Amino acid sequence: MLTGKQKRYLRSLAHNIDPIFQIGKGGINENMIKQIDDTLENRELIKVHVLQNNFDDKKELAETLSEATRSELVQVIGSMIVIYRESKENKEIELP
Template identity: 65%
Template sequence: MLTGKQKRYLRSEAHHLSPIFQVGKGGVNENMIKQIGEALEARELIKVSILQNCDQDKDEVALVISKGTRGEIVQKIGNTIVVYKESRENKKLELPKVK
C-alpha cells in the first residue's frame, strides 16, 4: 500500500508520460492485463487511457487492471489511470521512505 507522500511523488513522475494502453469497446481482457503487466515490469509507472466507447465503468477498469497486474492505482483523473508496480529486474523509481 502506497502512502500519500509516495503517491504524490509518483503522480509528479507520471505527469509527463503519455498513455501507452487504451481500453476501448471490448473492455479489459486477459491479453491486455498480460501486456500491461509486462509494461509495468519494464517501466514501473504507466498511464492507461479509457476511450469514450468503453462499456465498463472507469473505476471498474482501474480495479480489474490493479487486481490482474497486482499493481497499485496511483491516480484516476478524467479518462486516464496511472498504475505503479515495483519492478523486480528493472528498478528505476526510488519511492520516498515511510517513516
C-alpha cells in the same frame, strides 16, 4: 504496496508521461493487460489509457486493473489511469 504519500509523488510522475497500453471501451480486457503486463513489468510507473468513457466507472476498472497489475493506482486522469507496479529493477523511483 503503494501508500498515500507514495501516490501523490508518483501520481505526478505518470501525469506528464504517455500511456503505451490502451483499453477498449468495453472495459478492461486481458488481451490489453497481456500487453500492459509486459509493458508495466518492464517499467515502474504505468499510465494506461482506458476507454470506459464513464469517470466513476474508469475507477472501478482500476479495481480490476490494479488488482491484476499487482500495482497501486496513484490516480486516474480522465481516460488515463495512473498506477505504480511493485519494484523489481532499481529505477529512479520515489516512494516515501
